[PDB]
Structure formats: C-alpha cells, structure tokens
Amino acid sequence: NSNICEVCNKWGRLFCCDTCPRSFHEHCHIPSVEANKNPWSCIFCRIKTIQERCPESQSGHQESEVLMRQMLPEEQLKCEFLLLKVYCDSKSCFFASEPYYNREGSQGPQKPMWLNKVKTSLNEQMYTRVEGFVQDMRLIFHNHKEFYREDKFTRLGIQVQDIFEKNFRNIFAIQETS
C-alpha cells in the first residue's frame, strides 16, 4: 500500500485498501472508512466494480437524464466519489469549511455553500436526486465568482469547478461533445 493518504497526500493514521494499493485517512475517505470489514475495498475499487459488472454503463449519457436520477445506492456512491475527487485537489481547501463575507463593494451570497456541508448532506441522505448534489456543488463555485468580482482570487473558483466538471463527466459517463 501507499504510505500517504490518496486524498490529502499526508502521512498519518492510514487505512489501507485490500484490493488496490491506495491508503486513506479515516475522514478523508468518503464515506468515512468503515469500522470493521475485512477485506475492505476503497471507493475507487467500488466504482471500478460497478463499471465491470455493467460495461454498458460507460456508454454516453445526457446530463439532463443523469441529473434526474434518484439517489439509489449506485448514484449515492458515484456522488460520494465525485465529492472525493474534488477534495483530492489541494485547492479544495478554500471551499471546504463555512465561508464568511466582508469585502468592500461586495455582498455575500443568499445561499452559502461549502464542501463539508455537501459531505454532511450526502452522509445524512438529504439528496433524493443527483440534481440536488450537483446543484449544491455548482453553487459553491458560482457564489465564489460572484463575490470576488474582479479580484484575481475568482480564478480559484474556476479552477476547482473545472476539476468538478471533468470528474462529473467521467464518473457519470456524460456523452463527449465539441
């Protein structure tokens, strides 16, 4: 197994996957690394099994159909994995915890949102469709862009939204377009 967390790239108290060489801090894995379970398989491995069981699941899909899907166990897992892929980028730190807004010439968003809030919402099964999760994720970057206006810090929202969107298209097998 790797000697660093796959998510945050630090050492520490690491749980090792039994079916791949990745390792995780407990609360870096999503869902949090399960209490017992030997063997234990990471989210990466679980996602790969879904694909292997249903190879046609990789054929192109339309985003509008994906968004309307109910949050059955496989969709739940795919959103947890997509959330994790965002935390994998170090720039996710700026969007992880509850923000506050006090900048001359701007007003804070009407509906603040952050990654740990989406993480709790997934854990508490608060989303009934994929659309719920994707709208809260996109809201994080949209709030950032609007608040920071012409400050160059706006770019951090563009950067981490690009990671989200690439991974959304990969995990949900969105039909490739020009």
Binding site for Zn ion (CB under 5 A): 5, 7-8, 17, 20, 25, 28, 42, 44-45, 54
Angle made by CA atoms 129, 131, 132, in degrees to the nearest 5: 75
Smallest separation (angstroms) from Zn ion to the CB of 168: 21
CA dist., res. 150 & res. 166, Å (int):
25
Comparing CB distances to Zn ion, the nearer of 12 and 162 is 12
Smallest separation (angstroms) from Zn ion to the CB of 46: 8
Tokens 């969105």 belong to residue = 174
Comparing CB distances to Zn ion, the nearer of 45 and 173 is 45
CA dist., res. 125 & res. 85, Å (int):
19
Smallest separation (angstroms) from Zn ion to the CB of 177: 25
Smallest separation (angstroms) from Zn ion to the CB of 17: 3
Closest residue to Zn ion, judged by C-beta, is: 5
Comparing CB distances to Zn ion, the nearer of 95 and 127 is 95
Comparing CB distances to Zn ion, the nearer of 139 and 173 is 173
| CB burial string 48-61: b at 16+ within 10 A, e below | eebeeeeeeeeeee
If phi over 0 gives left and psi between -120 and 50 gives alpha, with beta otherwise, what is residue 92?
alpha
The DSSP string of 129-166 is: BHHHHHHHHHHHHHHHHHHHTTSTTHHHHHHHHHHHHH
Smallest separation (angstroms) from Zn ion to the CB of 21: 8
Comparing CB distances to Zn ion, the nearer of 30 and 66 is 30
